[PDB]
Structure 1
Amino acid sequence: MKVAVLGAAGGIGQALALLLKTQLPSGSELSLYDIAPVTPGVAVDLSHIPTAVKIKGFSGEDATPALEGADVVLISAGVRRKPGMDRSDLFNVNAGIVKNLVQQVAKTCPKACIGIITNPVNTTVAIAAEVLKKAGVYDKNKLFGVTTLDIIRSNTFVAELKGKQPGEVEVPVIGGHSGVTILPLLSQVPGVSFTEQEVADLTKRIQNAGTEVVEAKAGGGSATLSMGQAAARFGLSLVRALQGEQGVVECAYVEGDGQYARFFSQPLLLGKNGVEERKSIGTLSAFEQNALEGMLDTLKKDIALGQEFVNK
């Protein structure tokens, strides 16, 4: 596999880089791209680690070199929010960045699996899809909004509440990636039960976890190291599936049948061509049904904002 990381010099990009360098299968290639001029030196730094993964870094305005022959592209370029901001407040700086980078992907490697990490994900994934459509090159099985951080956050918060080993708990999370649209499916966590007070409290802690880190960093940024970890998990799942491994399933924000919104995050069976099947969200509790119904008008306004930017 070749994996390209666009936005490699940032806080997220460097942590992701470190993890992919040390965890990608033997024989893999990793290319790093960022406009920042330190980027080739980030690749040299990493190239001193003894693993059988070839790494090169690229700088400047053209990402073509990084993108040639890429199977997976992971996009983490863009600005972080400051205390007192919402994710949607990032639209004005980041919409242009994502539009610019996906046109480059559309020209150079239109068959790659593309993971959008750039905030606000609910909207930027729709920007990506519209760009790829205009280029005559959209495949809805190969475009992903990366929501994996919500998953590993829920796993951590549940295990500590319920006295479980953190690596042993997996919770499904559906919806989107904003404070209102993150819905952890706590009724479906095997082997654990929660009171309704535990469900309310946990769901809030999970929805507000991004603002918790932003507040804690005090103007020094948002989640970088945990997000690096989450994105490396998703990327390695993509790579595993693309190499033919069976039964790899991840939740991600993806264009589907539209039963709830155009884009919606749900569990997905991954295969050699991207998403193999979009799995059922299953049976919801009364809390979960209610939370879902309540999020739906905010979700599709997020989507329409993205499509607007590209189509007007």
Structure 2
Amino acid sequence: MKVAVLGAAGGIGQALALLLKTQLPSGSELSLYDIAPVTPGVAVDLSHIPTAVKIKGFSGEDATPALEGADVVLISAGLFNVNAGIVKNLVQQVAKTCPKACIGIITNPVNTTVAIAAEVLKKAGVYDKNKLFGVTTLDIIRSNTFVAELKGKQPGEVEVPVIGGHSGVTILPLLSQVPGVSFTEQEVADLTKRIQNAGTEVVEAKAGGGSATLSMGQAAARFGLSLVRALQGEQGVVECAYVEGDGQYARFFSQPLLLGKNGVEERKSIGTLSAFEQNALEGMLDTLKKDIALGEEFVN
């Protein structure tokens, strides 16, 4: 089991690397890759932690040594054209070195960058739609936190499904599907807007001096550790993530996924929707389809 983090010297990358060094299964391997020259030393720093996870760091423009043998690749590297070009650059290297890895895209805008990655993998002839994921997990853990606060529940016991996309009106938390929890329509509307805009809470409180890094590291570690468990054969592992699916709603769409040894094992039904959720779903499909087309176009 080898996990590669691309963008590992960044705010998200170092938090993710710290959590993976401490939480990956014993016997795992972790590789860190970033164009920042500090990256080998970030790994050495982390290698002093006494867990059975072997870690090495790499810099320069050739990610090959970090990607060789990787089972999972998490990309937190990173205005649109710059991030789009980074994802294209890195996924080209993934395609050449570890094309059978599960790939988690953190780089925003996820709705678009996942489509960029898919087209790159298709042009290389190695695209496996069961192994490409947009990491939306921050939407889920935010939803869990906010619902638990409002309902006086223990935050670690609340799990909110979140479907759709990962930006603005495309984020659809299914607050109607939370066990033991029931909200008024006004509460749903206000809480949905809060979840959709939650990243701005961080930006504003950082005094305009930064964005969410630590909670995204945690969300990415949750998603990555879920992939690792499933790839090892553990059963019952379910995460929402933005994937190419059956196209019922859009070509790419986030929904609950049963994970397994080949990536997605089953794309699960989004289930029964409230009137609010049905309306919001219909209402954002045009936006989501435009985000997807922007990625396909960028690669041409």
Q: What's the TM-score bracket when you normalise by the shorter of the two chains? A: over 0.9
Say if 2:73 is the partner of 1:73.
yes
Note the C-alpha offset of 1:254.
0.1
Number of aligned positions between the proteins: 299
The Cα shift of 1:209 comes to 0.2
SS of 1:267 mapped into structure 2? strand
Q: CA offsets per residue over residues 213-267 of structure 1, 9 Å max, x none?
A: 1122123221000000000000000000000000100000000000110000000
Q: Deviations over 1:11-35 (max 9, x none)?
A: 0000000000000011000000000
SS of the equivalent of 1:211 reads helix
Task: Measure, in 1, the Cα distance between the counterparts of 2:191 and 2:5.
Answer: 33
Which whole-Å deviations, capped at 9, do the CAs of 1:188-224 have from their partners, x for residues lacking one?
0011111111111111111110112112212322100
RMSD: 0.6
- Mapped partners of 2:102, 2:210: distance in 1: 28
- The residue aligned with 2:181 is 192
Instruction: Name 2:134's counterpart in structure 1.
Output: 145
- The equivalent of 2:26 in structure 1 is 26
5+ residue gaps, structure 2: none
Q: Any idea what the Cα deviations from partners look like across 1:39-73, whole Å, max 9, x if unmatched?
A: 01100100000000000000000000000000000
Q: TM-score, normalised by structure 1?
A: 0.95
Which segment is superposed worse, 217-226 or 258-267?
217-226
Q: 1:89-108, aligned counterparts within 5 Å?
A: 90-108=79-97
Q: For each residue in 1:259-289, what CA deviation from the matched residue of structure 2 results, as whole angstroms up to 9, or x when unmatched?
A: 1100000000000000000000011101001
Distance 1:219 1:35 in 2: 25
Q: Secondary structure at the match of 2:168?
A: coil
CA distance in structure 2 between the partners assigned to 1:220 and 1:32 by the alignment: 26
CA shift at 1:91, angstroms? 1.3
**How far apart, CA to CA, are the structure 2 residues paired with 1:8 and 1:171?**
28
2:161 to 172, 192, 207: 172
Q: Which residue of 1 aligns with 2:13?
A: 13
CA distance in 1, matches of 2:247, 2:204: 35
Task: Give the ranges of 4+ consecutive aligned residues of structure 1 lying more than 2 Å apart after TM superposition.
Answer: none
Structure 1 residue matching 2:183: 3-state secondary structure: coil
Q: Separation in 2 of the partners of 1:176 and 1:213?
A: 20
Q: Deviations over 1:48-105 (max 9, x none)?
A: 000000000000000000000000000000xxxxxxxxxxxx3122000000000000
Q: Please show how residues 25-174 of structure 1 align to structure 2 within 5 Å.
A: 25-77=25-77, 90-174=79-163
1:180 Cα shift? 1.3
Q: Name the SS for the 1:98 alignment partner.
A: helix
Separation (CA, whole Å) in 2 of partners of 1:23 and 1:155: 21
Give the SS at the match of 1:180.
helix
1-structure distance, mates of 2:208, 2:283: 31
The 3-state SS of whatever aligns with 2:209 is coil
CA distance in 1 between counterparts of 2:111 and 2:211 reads 18
Give secondary structure in 2 for the equivalent of 1:55.
strand
Distance 2:176 2:25 in 1: 35
In 1: Cα distance, 2:168 partner to 2:220 partner: 19
Q: Identify the range of structure 1 (294-303 vs 212-221) with the bigger mean alpha-carbon deviation.
A: 212-221
Distance (whole Å) between structure 1 residues aligned to residue 93 and residue 210 of structure 2: 28
- TM-score (normalised: structure 2): 0.99
> Helix, strand or coil for the counterpart of 2:272?
coil
